[PDB]
Design an enzyme around this catalytic site. Structure first.
Site, PDB file in Angstrom:
ATOM      1  N   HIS A   1       0.831  -1.222   0.000  1.00 58.26           N
ATOM      2  CA  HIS A   1       0.000   0.000   0.000  1.00 58.26           C
ATOM      3  C   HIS A   1       0.851   1.250   0.000  1.00 58.26           C
ATOM      4  CE1 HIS A   1      -3.160  -2.782   1.225  1.00 58.26           C
ATOM      5  NE2 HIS A   1      -2.401  -3.122   2.253  1.00 58.26           N
TER       6      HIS A   1
ATOM      7  N   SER B   1       2.098  -0.793  -5.455  1.00 61.64           N
ATOM      8  CA  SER B   1       1.082  -1.027  -4.415  1.00 61.64           C
ATOM      9  C   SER B   1       0.603  -2.491  -4.433  1.00 61.64           C
ATOM     10  CB  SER B   1      -0.097  -0.065  -4.595  1.00 61.64           C
ATOM     11  OG  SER B   1      -0.768   0.154  -3.366  1.00 61.64           O
TER      12      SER B   1
ATOM     13  N   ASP C   1       3.588  -7.599   0.889  1.00 63.57           N
ATOM     14  CA  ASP C   1       2.399  -7.563   1.735  1.00 63.57           C
ATOM     15  C   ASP C   1       1.281  -8.157   0.881  1.00 63.57           C
ATOM     16  OD1 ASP C   1      -0.286  -6.292   2.542  1.00 63.57           O
ATOM     17  OD2 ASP C   1       0.932  -5.472   4.160  1.00 63.57           O
TER      18      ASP C   1
ATOM     19  N   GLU D   1       4.594  -9.788   5.613  1.00 64.41           N
ATOM     20  CA  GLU D   1       3.972  -9.259   6.835  1.00 64.41           C
ATOM     21  C   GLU D   1       2.475  -9.517   7.032  1.00 64.41           C
ATOM     22  OE1 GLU D   1       3.368  -4.578   5.317  1.00 64.41           O
ATOM     23  OE2 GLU D   1       4.617  -5.042   7.052  1.00 64.41           O
TER      24      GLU D   1
ATOM     25  N   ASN E   1      -3.132  -5.772  15.082  1.00 65.08           N
ATOM     26  CA  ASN E   1      -4.384  -6.431  15.490  1.00 65.08           C
ATOM     27  C   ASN E   1      -5.079  -5.772  16.686  1.00 65.08           C
ATOM     28  OD1 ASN E   1      -3.603  -8.241  13.489  1.00 65.08           O
ATOM     29  ND2 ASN E   1      -2.835  -9.763  14.936  1.00 65.08           N
TER      30      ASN E   1
ATOM     31  N   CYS F   1      -6.749  -1.528  16.116  1.00 65.64           N
ATOM     32  CA  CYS F   1      -8.208  -1.600  16.051  1.00 65.64           C
ATOM     33  C   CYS F   1      -8.849  -0.970  17.272  1.00 65.64           C
ATOM     34  CB  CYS F   1      -8.676  -3.040  15.880  1.00 65.64           C
ATOM     35  SG  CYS F   1      -8.107  -3.773  14.332  1.00 65.64           S
TER      36      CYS F   1
ATOM     37  N   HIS G   1     -12.627  -9.894   9.154  1.00 65.02           N
ATOM     38  CA  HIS G   1     -12.313 -10.406   7.835  1.00 65.02           C
ATOM     39  C   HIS G   1     -12.983  -9.588   6.754  1.00 65.02           C
ATOM     40  CE1 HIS G   1     -12.222 -12.884   4.263  1.00 65.02           C
ATOM     41  NE2 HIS G   1     -11.288 -13.623   4.835  1.00 65.02           N
TER      42      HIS G   1
ATOM     43  N   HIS H   1      -5.141   2.433  10.260  1.00 64.30           N
ATOM     44  CA  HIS H   1      -4.272   2.401  11.440  1.00 64.30           C
ATOM     45  C   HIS H   1      -3.529   3.720  11.614  1.00 64.30           C
ATOM     46  CE1 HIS H   1      -5.031  -1.655  12.501  1.00 64.30           C
ATOM     47  NE2 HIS H   1      -4.207  -2.246  11.655  1.00 64.30           N
TER      48      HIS H   1
ATOM     49  N   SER I   1       5.167  -2.197  12.363  1.00 60.31           N
ATOM     50  CA  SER I   1       5.109  -3.183  11.277  1.00 60.31           C
ATOM     51  C   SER I   1       6.245  -2.997  10.277  1.00 60.31           C
ATOM     52  CB  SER I   1       3.759  -3.123  10.548  1.00 60.31           C
ATOM     53  OG  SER I   1       2.693  -3.478  11.425  1.00 60.31           O
TER      54      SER I   1
ATOM     55  N   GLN J   1       9.919  -5.017   9.103  1.00 64.28           N
ATOM     56  CA  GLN J   1      10.360  -5.370   7.751  1.00 64.28           C
ATOM     57  C   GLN J   1      11.746  -4.862   7.370  1.00 64.28           C
ATOM     58  OE1 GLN J   1       6.899  -4.738   5.470  1.00 64.28           O
ATOM     59  NE2 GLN J   1       6.796  -6.867   4.767  1.00 64.28           N
TER      60      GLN J   1
HETATM   61  N1  NAD Z   1      -9.649  -4.332  10.400  1.00 69.11           N
HETATM   62  C1  NAD Z   1      -8.279  -4.389  10.316  1.00 69.11           C
HETATM   63  O1  NAD Z   1      -7.544  -3.500   9.905  1.00 69.11           O
HETATM   64  C2  NAD Z   1      -7.683  -5.644  10.782  1.00 69.11           C
HETATM   65  C3  NAD Z   1      -6.447  -5.590  11.395  1.00 69.11           C
HETATM   66  C4  NAD Z   1      -5.865  -6.759  11.840  1.00 69.11           C
HETATM   67  C5  NAD Z   1      -6.542  -7.946  11.655  1.00 69.11           C
HETATM   68  N2  NAD Z   1      -7.736  -7.965  11.055  1.00 69.11           N
HETATM   69  C6  NAD Z   1      -8.457  -9.221  10.864  1.00 69.11           C
HETATM   70  O2  NAD Z   1      -9.265  -9.493  11.996  1.00 69.11           O
HETATM   71  C7  NAD Z   1      -9.556 -10.885  12.055  1.00 69.11           C
HETATM   72  C8  NAD Z   1      -9.257 -11.400  13.446  1.00 69.11           C
HETATM   73  O3  NAD Z   1      -7.912 -11.073  13.755  1.00 69.11           O
HETATM   74  P1  NAD Z   1      -7.309 -11.552  15.179  1.00 69.11           P
HETATM   75  O4  NAD Z   1      -5.826 -11.280  15.188  1.00 69.11           O
HETATM   76  O5  NAD Z   1      -8.195 -11.065  16.296  1.00 69.11           O
HETATM   77  O6  NAD Z   1      -7.553 -13.150  15.011  1.00 69.11           O
HETATM   78  P2  NAD Z   1      -7.607 -14.231  16.213  1.00 69.11           P
HETATM   79  O7  NAD Z   1      -7.520 -15.624  15.640  1.00 69.11           O
HETATM   80  O8  NAD Z   1      -6.663 -13.743  17.282  1.00 69.11           O
HETATM   81  O9  NAD Z   1      -9.131 -13.890  16.710  1.00 69.11           O
HETATM   82  C9  NAD Z   1     -10.256 -14.490  16.075  1.00 69.11           C
HETATM   83  C10 NAD Z   1     -11.154 -15.064  17.152  1.00 69.11           C
HETATM   84  O10 NAD Z   1     -12.460 -15.289  16.633  1.00 69.11           O
HETATM   85  C11 NAD Z   1     -12.970 -16.480  17.212  1.00 69.11           C
HETATM   86  N3  NAD Z   1     -14.067 -16.986  16.396  1.00 69.11           N
HETATM   87  C12 NAD Z   1     -13.954 -17.708  15.240  1.00 69.11           C
HETATM   88  N4  NAD Z   1     -15.118 -18.020  14.719  1.00 69.11           N
HETATM   89  C13 NAD Z   1     -16.035 -17.475  15.572  1.00 69.11           C
HETATM   90  C14 NAD Z   1     -17.419 -17.467  15.560  1.00 69.11           C
HETATM   91  N5  NAD Z   1     -18.137 -18.102  14.540  1.00 69.11           N
HETATM   92  N6  NAD Z   1     -18.056 -16.835  16.553  1.00 69.11           N
HETATM   93  C15 NAD Z   1     -17.334 -16.241  17.509  1.00 69.11           C
HETATM   94  N7  NAD Z   1     -16.004 -16.185  17.626  1.00 69.11           N
HETATM   95  C16 NAD Z   1     -15.407 -16.826  16.619  1.00 69.11           C
HETATM   96  C17 NAD Z   1     -11.770 -17.385  17.327  1.00 69.11           C
HETATM   97  O11 NAD Z   1     -11.935 -18.264  18.432  1.00 69.11           O
HETATM   98  C18 NAD Z   1     -10.622 -16.418  17.556  1.00 69.11           C
HETATM   99  O12 NAD Z   1     -10.288 -16.350  18.933  1.00 69.11           O
HETATM  100  C19 NAD Z   1      -8.683 -11.557  11.016  1.00 69.11           C
HETATM  101  O13 NAD Z   1      -9.547 -11.847   9.926  1.00 69.11           O
HETATM  102  C20 NAD Z   1      -7.664 -10.490  10.644  1.00 69.11           C
HETATM  103  O14 NAD Z   1      -7.308 -10.591   9.277  1.00 69.11           O
HETATM  104  C21 NAD Z   1      -8.328  -6.853  10.613  1.00 69.11           C
HETATM  105  C1  9W1 Z   2      -8.942   4.848   4.581  1.00 66.59           C
HETATM  106  O1  9W1 Z   2      -7.600   5.320   4.498  1.00 66.59           O
HETATM  107  C2  9W1 Z   2      -6.659   4.324   4.230  1.00 66.59           C
HETATM  108  C3  9W1 Z   2      -5.387   4.608   4.677  1.00 66.59           C
HETATM  109  C4  9W1 Z   2      -4.365   3.709   4.465  1.00 66.59           C
HETATM  110  C5  9W1 Z   2      -4.611   2.529   3.799  1.00 66.59           C
HETATM  111  C6  9W1 Z   2      -5.880   2.231   3.346  1.00 66.59           C
HETATM  112  N1  9W1 Z   2      -6.139   1.027   2.663  1.00 66.59           N
HETATM  113  C7  9W1 Z   2      -5.980  -0.310   3.092  1.00 66.59           C
HETATM  114  C8  9W1 Z   2      -6.576  -1.321   2.364  1.00 66.59           C
HETATM  115  C9  9W1 Z   2      -6.424  -2.626   2.781  1.00 66.59           C
HETATM  116  C10 9W1 Z   2      -7.070  -3.711   1.994  1.00 66.59           C
HETATM  117  N2  9W1 Z   2      -5.718  -2.978   3.863  1.00 66.59           N
HETATM  118  C11 9W1 Z   2      -5.143  -1.995   4.567  1.00 66.59           C
HETATM  119  C12 9W1 Z   2      -4.351  -2.416   5.775  1.00 66.59           C
HETATM  120  C13 9W1 Z   2      -4.955  -2.207   7.144  1.00 66.59           C
HETATM  121  C14 9W1 Z   2      -4.541  -0.810   7.515  1.00 66.59           C
HETATM  122  N3  9W1 Z   2      -3.249  -0.618   6.906  1.00 66.59           N
HETATM  123  C15 9W1 Z   2      -2.744   0.680   6.842  1.00 66.59           C
HETATM  124  O2  9W1 Z   2      -3.303   1.629   7.380  1.00 66.59           O
HETATM  125  C16 9W1 Z   2      -1.507   0.944   6.131  1.00 66.59           C
HETATM  126  N4  9W1 Z   2      -0.787   0.017   5.490  1.00 66.59           N
HETATM  127  O3  9W1 Z   2       0.299   0.693   4.957  1.00 66.59           O
HETATM  128  N5  9W1 Z   2       0.262   2.043   5.271  1.00 66.59           N
HETATM  129  C17 9W1 Z   2      -0.850   2.198   5.993  1.00 66.59           C
HETATM  130  N6  9W1 Z   2      -1.307   3.356   6.528  1.00 66.59           N
HETATM  131  C18 9W1 Z   2      -3.035  -1.688   5.948  1.00 66.59           C
HETATM  132  C19 9W1 Z   2      -5.251  -0.662   4.213  1.00 66.59           C
HETATM  133  C20 9W1 Z   2      -6.903   3.134   3.560  1.00 66.59           C
END
Ligand code: NAD
Ligand code: 9W1
Ligand code: NAD
Ligand code: NAD
Ligand code: NAD
Ligand code: 9W1
Ligand code: 9W1
Ligand code: 9W1
Lengths: 429, 429, 429, 429
Positions: free
Chosen positions: A52, A75, A128, A153, A188, A192, A298, A350, A358, A362
């Site tokens: 990205h 990207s 990535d 990563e 993670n 978040c 997810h 983030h 992160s 790297q």
């Molecule tokens: N939004 C973001 O930017 C962002 C950032 C990091 C990770 N993620 C994503 O978030 C998701 C979770 O990440 P994590 O590190 O917490 O994973 P993790 O494995 O630590 O946490 C997932 C939890 O969900 C539970 N679970 C699974 N199925 C379930 C269900 N049907 N009902 C209830 N609980 C259930 C599991 O027991 C597990 O503990 C991943 O898909 C990851 O890719 C998103």
């Molecule tokens: C809404 O504004 C933005 C700003 C930045 C990026 C995005 N777009 C995505 C799209 C997808 C699919 N995944 C990601 C991941 C989770 C968050 N990450 C970063 O923030 C990040 N990663 O590298 N520099 C960063 N900054 C990486 C970001 C959107």
């Protein structure tokens, strides 16, 4: 042949301004520059990057160049490029091929432009998502002997490297930084925790205090979401399939029950599971009027959004990435970011400080593989703890932390080096 | 020859009363009794146990007998036996050799009375500290061929097992229960979170709110201690040598600095490091008048109590396990439990629910080794994740937690069995 | 003469959509509509209202019309009107005179259009700031005999009412709604707790966890701000001049020190004091590079923004309401909202649920004065406790709170009515 | 005629030791000594005291003498006297008439011994409960003209003074310190927050984390109890009759419902209401097995303990102040302190620092009435805010707080004195 391809090179001054601000929130990368800009441990390296193309990644790119490497960049997603960031990297004389709103054909082309340098082909992969790694192995396997290492990563990319190794496809040593403590915890949990409510607030401006918030999953993402919501005075309910994670939630005083039960009680719903079919039509039908439903786990598979489109009697867009459905029972559901990531759809992703951890991971991986030619055989290796520790240490100054140094006597008594590592490989923190 | 040996078997009605109360707080062990008393999975087993002869251990003991086992017991420490618990176990026809205030010769004697049963010698070891394991290998090696397995729950014992294995001394398969998530989190984090302040209060009756509390270490014990103090409205300052653990503290908003600076600021001092030379004369000389100093980490090596005894102008016993010193500067220090463990010296140690998790790990290990000899080579093995999950699952009913079951479809999507395990072995929770 | 005046009545479908969403977050006002639309307790009333013409105020307005009143409105601030809200009120046949970006002459004009209705002049005042009250008394004193009551919700307005009463200028009974528990707690504590960090995030997207945040003041706004920052894992340092408020902060474990010392430590600065000269050049000169400075307390007098404008070597606008200064020492300061209110400049102000409490206080005051003229002498009166309780009770259903009713026996034991009031007037909650 | 009457004057050295320790936790009283031991503002005063003759009250007594007053003392309860504390006051040459385990006849006698001094009758009353105040008005009304003032610190005593004034019985000006912020907050909120769990732990040693804890009432006592329980990881449910207090609880994320509902869910029950009939037989019949039931609110009237005695099939004493009942349904209730105050029955009451605030309030009252002969007419007066502020300020040094001083310009702008008071009388903190 093109020296770069960006949307608008005139955005470079705006990029440089954003870069100046981000650098102060990315001390890990700036520490690497301070420590290594004279010794230049990446001199000789020719790093093709696929990540990205944001302001944050620009600080990473310029850190790598400062360390002596030649760098060419694309990207890893067709919409994540921030054009002003890309412009600034182009203007600095670094080959960057990225813009916001690429086609699939343009996307592949961009990655292909990073493979060949002035003096020769790439000798290092920074990835990535595994797309650069997959492109080389399927389409350009001639270059594999000349590539010393891969840093990766993301969960998808690491899962992909393990399958390639299992099947005999993988020909380059790979460092997985996804499972570093410093990478995982910031990406993670802490990340978040900061951005969930940011997204919900920008989307809805709603009062959090006094609401029941149902958080599906209590892994690292769920933990952070739950803590965040709780801090504002919401009453958080957890759902979980893992009894250990469920137990952890209970010991913090969170009610733990099923979505079947909790769908009737929740004012706000947050899915963090990584799994399909978390929130479903039969849950929606039981929800209180104007329940807010979003996903931070997810990509887009946790909530059955297709059900809402097919069964609701009204769909009204409130603002970008905020839709309000009316159901046949006459009640409303407020759905955020079309069931995709609320932190990307309704906020800015983030914070910079997260990305610092992160990307500093790297930089460590790149140095480690490049500086030690014969140390790593072909396969997927965890980043050694001492480097994970060095990532954390690089941020402590910014965090206003004074770390204690073990005396020689203390280190002897513990049976460890006074420079680390300080924990065994199975330590969970 | 002697059927048991206790201080006073008249205390059995008192022991029995305490057992009944404890059972309700130990659902892990009671769940094992419910699930396994019909199938008697430990039928045939003659388990020698060396473990603090407490009310909690007494519940473990009777759980093992409910599962079909014959068992004979001794305490793993000379003062840890609760006589009423021992008396209740004795009256129940369990051969138990343990009392509060044993001599070192009597301690050895007690363990030696557990090796030989009615029908013959022991065939299984349940151990805490490695003493029963070290006694068999050096003094009764003839009994080793007939012993199927060892379960060990202590850091001391596991390090000892690894050295025995490295030097070819170990002759029996051993499950390490100390590094289970359910054991480690309860024994280290939640247990100390529950009892730190219990000890300080019982010792001093001091207001906690509005004090500066200095916690040395931010591992699992430090985390728990810090969280507890913070809940009462104390301002918690942390000291650390590990960059990762230090950063974790910073990200929860704790000040992180050195003991050299913090010794001038703290009203309360808690050492959790497991390391030597944490609090020194150097530090005592700077403390505020009537600073409270205590250790909940390693046995007795963290605080330099010897310095106080040699350099103070006064040492006054306030009550048992509470000494107030006056220094040459005229200021006073309140030392708890003689620099030994505050939660044991000044309180009642871990709550029953904590030991339920640790001892439910033990039962799982004993079943696993007696039921599947074939499975484990001579060596030290982590408890399998599925059993660790089962320990947690067994406690959820008591917590009124409703766990979600994955659908067949969801489990196939996640690439895991819907009965677990749910996490890879590197997952840190 | 002109039936209303808005920027663009084409925005009415947009306003209406926003109203529908807001209604569900304003249960206090909707509960009034449910309880009182049959009895029309404000039938006859011609209420002139001077209050920020927002979506929230628009719900209040339509609540007053549901209760039988005729009403005519203007904003109490030149920029606070939300045009879509005003357009929706206009299309509904409510005479409203308000738009974003009024001139001072236009502002006066707008208020003057609310004094005379179809059937005759106004007979009730609902006010915010005292402007509508000051206009009637100085410029339309002939209308004063026909006005039954004033309700006032602002600190500014209430001080102004007391001075008018002390100097014989006040000619109408007035209920003070500003010092209700339900108004004060939501407007000051919970509102600022909900929105402080919303503003900082929208302005900067900065990580909050692991920063030192300096909050000047620990009144209700400071308490809320401090709690919020702390929830995100920031380390909060507090400054105070009141010994009681300072002690309150100490007892929650906050460091309490002076701005003179804290200016060298803070990454973030939030002023909540309502007082002049809180952050000065003196302090700016000592701050860490890229310290974020913002005010959520008094309008614009807490930070010396004038010093920055006069002494900085650079002032760069980053985005609307975000300015980054470079000082002569080379370090940068990020000022939010030009030293004005961060929650209004950089976010959307108070959540709807907060205004529901403040405006449900207003409806109670308007009913109380129009229904019982006999009751109140010319003067400033606190809202009666029973009505304050009723405001809270009206919001409990939305919160899924089941309140307990005292038995006859319990009420007789406590010497109170089982319908309230439940507390004496000195009770501080 | 007797110069004192205590249990054992030989306990005086032990008393003096406890006094030396308590003084360091009572800075408010020690500040009063530092400020006033030379000026002696109570010279001339002849103070009869009636208050729990504890170590803490001994520090109060010796503070009053240090300020120039003659002092004679009795206890306000027949069991609260700590004999070593009483011995130390006797040995110091201060007439004290108090011991643990007085008869009603002995109790009255003790109070009567404090009325007459060497030079004449008492001229000041320091009271906790109104017994000294009631004795003078009913039995010794001859002395009323010679008494300049009454200080009173309890709810009962203040309620009693208001009735005496309403009926024309009250003949001396009285200062109520019960409703000082510094008195009320420490006695009700901070005090019970520290000691609730202390009591539960010493009584049961039970795990708090993971339990549902039902707290009846959310006034100052409930608030503290709830916060305490929550900090340990319990899930707290609140019950309330007041909608404002209920609303406050909801905004912190506490579930709020009725005891009728919550009796089925709670593992732990805490009554804090001040009201009869909170926990009743029909609640007990629904409780989970071994539910812990205790009271920290009103003396002994909140729980229907008589029901348990009359309907249970077993009652077993576990230890002092811990009884375990078995009901006809076969389940057990663990009742603490026989339904009386858990913090007094199962712990050591309030910490010294709490008592420091309450007693420093009373030293202020005594000086204020004695130093200003004609200032206060006959009646019940609140302690002025400036003195309440001075109480808080006296503790700040111990709390490690640096208070800010308003500049003359700042004070002018705020329209207050730079020495205070800083808030209006209706301010709630
Ligand atoms: N939004 C973001 O930017 C962002 C950032 C990091 C990770 N993620 C994503 O978030 C998701 C979770 O990440 P994590 O590190 O917490 O994973 P993790 O494995 O630590 O946490 C997932 C939890 O969900 C539970 N679970 C699974 N199925 C379930 C269900 N049907 N009902 C209830 N609980 C259930 C599991 O027991 C597990 O503990 C991943 O898909 C990851 O890719 C998103
Ligand atoms: C809404 O504004 C933005 C700003 C930045 C990026 C995005 N777009 C995505 C799209 C997808 C699919 N995944 C990601 C991941 C989770 C968050 N990450 C970063 O923030 C990040 N990663 O590298 N520099 C960063 N900054 C990486 C970001 C959107
Ligand atoms: N009181 C009890 O009943 C009880 C219960 C469980 C564990 N323990 C003991 O507590 C100790 C710690 O256990 P843990 O699980 O927290 O271990 P851990 O390794 O998780 O935590 C120890 C922490 O101390 C830090 N540390 C080491 N030396 C230091 C120094 N000189 N200054 C500052 N920090 C330093 C390390 O970085 C580490 O993070 C062990 O000795 C363990 O046996 C006691
Ligand atoms: N941002 C908003 O929308 C919003 C909402 C409500 C109130 N406010 C404003 O916030 C301000 C404070 O309101 P509040 O209810 O917290 O008032 P308050 O009186 O409860 O709190 C103000 C605190 O600031 C302290 N203080 C005063 N001067 C100080 C100084 N020089 N240094 C340190 N502390 C100092 C006082 O001791 C007091 O405790 C007011 O100006 C009010 O109008 C703003
Ligand atoms: N244990 C101690 O040492 C100690 C210390 C201080 C005060 N107290 C006592 O604690 C009690 C409460 O003190 P406080 O300052 O919190 O009083 P408060 O008036 O602030 O709190 C009492 C709360 O209980 C609520 N309530 C009344 N009846 C109820 C019912 N039937 N169900 C649910 N809630 C109900 C009221 O609405 C009120 O908010 C008083 O009796 C006081 O004497 C005890
Ligand atoms: C104060 O009274 C008591 C009560 C119980 C035990 C002890 N004595 C010791 C002594 C030593 C050296 N180590 C321990 C550890 C740490 C905590 N543990 C337990 O609490 C525990 N272990 O088995 N049942 C338990 N309960 C084991 C406990 C003292
Ligand atoms: C950023 O966009 C907005 C949104 C809403 C209002 C404003 N404008 C102001 C301007 C001034 C000077 N004061 C206020 C106060 C403080 C908070 N208040 C409300 O939020 C509020 N009051 O009525 N409905 C409400 N909503 C009233 C708000 C700006
Ligand atoms: C179990 O140990 C103790 C220790 C001290 C006193 C008591 N006895 C009572 C009895 C009654 C009926 N009321 C109280 C109140 C509430 C708590 N208070 C104090 O703690 C206190 N008050 O003066 N010095 C103090 N210390 C006063 C205390 C019991």
């Amino acid at each position: 042949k093109l020296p770069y391809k960006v949307a608008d090179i005139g955005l470079a001054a705006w990029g440089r301004k954003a870069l100046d601000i981000a650098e102060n929130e990315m001390p890990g990368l700036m520490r690497m520059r301070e420590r290594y800009s004279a010794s230049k441990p990446l001199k000789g390296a020719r790093i093709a990057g696929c990540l990205h193309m944001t302001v944050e990644t620009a600080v990473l790119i310029e850190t790598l160049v400062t360390l002596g490497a030649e760098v060419q960049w694309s990207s890893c997603n067709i919409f994540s490029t921030q054009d002003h960031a890309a412009a600034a990297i182009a203007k600095a004389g670094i080959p960057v091929y990225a813009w916001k709103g690429e086609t699939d054909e343009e996307y592949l082309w961009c990655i292909e432009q990073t493979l060949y340098f002035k003096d020769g082909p790439l000798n290092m992969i920074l990835d990535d998502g595994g797309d650069l790694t997959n492109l080389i192995h399927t389409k350009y396997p001639q270059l594999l002997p000349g590539i010393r290492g891969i840093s990766e990563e993301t969960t998808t990319g690491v899962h992909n490297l393990y399958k390639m190794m299992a099947n005999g496809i993988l020909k380059v040593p790979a460092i997985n930084v996804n499972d570093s403590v410093t990478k995982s915890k910031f990406d993670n949990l802490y990340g978040c925790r900061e951005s969930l409510i940011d997204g919900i607030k920008r989307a809805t401006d709603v009062m959090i205090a006094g609401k029941v918030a149902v958080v599906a999953g209590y892994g690292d993402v769920g933990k952070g979401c739950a803590q965040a919501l709780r801090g504002f005075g919401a009453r958080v309910i957890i759902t979980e399939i893992d009894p250990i994670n469920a137990l952890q939630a209970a010991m913090e005083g969170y009610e733990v029950t099923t979505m079947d039960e909790a769908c009737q009680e929740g004012n706000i719903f947050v899915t963090t599971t990584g799994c399909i079919d978390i929130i479903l039509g039969r849950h929606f039908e039981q929800m209180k009027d104007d329940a807010i439903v979003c996903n931070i786990g997810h990509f887009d598979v946790e909530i059955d959004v297709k059900w809402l489109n097919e069964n609701a009697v009204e769909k009204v867009n409130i603002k970008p990435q905020v839709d309000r459905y009316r159901l046949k029972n006459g009640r409303r559901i407020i759905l955020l970011a079309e069931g995709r990531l609320v932190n990307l759809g309704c906020a800015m992703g983030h914070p910079s400080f997260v990305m610092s951890n992160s990307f500093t991971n790297q930089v460590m991986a790149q140095i480690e593989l490049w500086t030690h030619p014969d140390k790593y055989p072909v396969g997927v290796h965890f980043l050694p703890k001492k480097l994970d520790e060095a990532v954390a240490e690089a941020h402590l100054g910014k965090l206003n932390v004074k770390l204690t140094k073990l005396t020689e006597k203390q280190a002897q008594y513990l049976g460890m080096s006074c420079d680390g590592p300080f924990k065994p490989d199975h330590y969970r923190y």
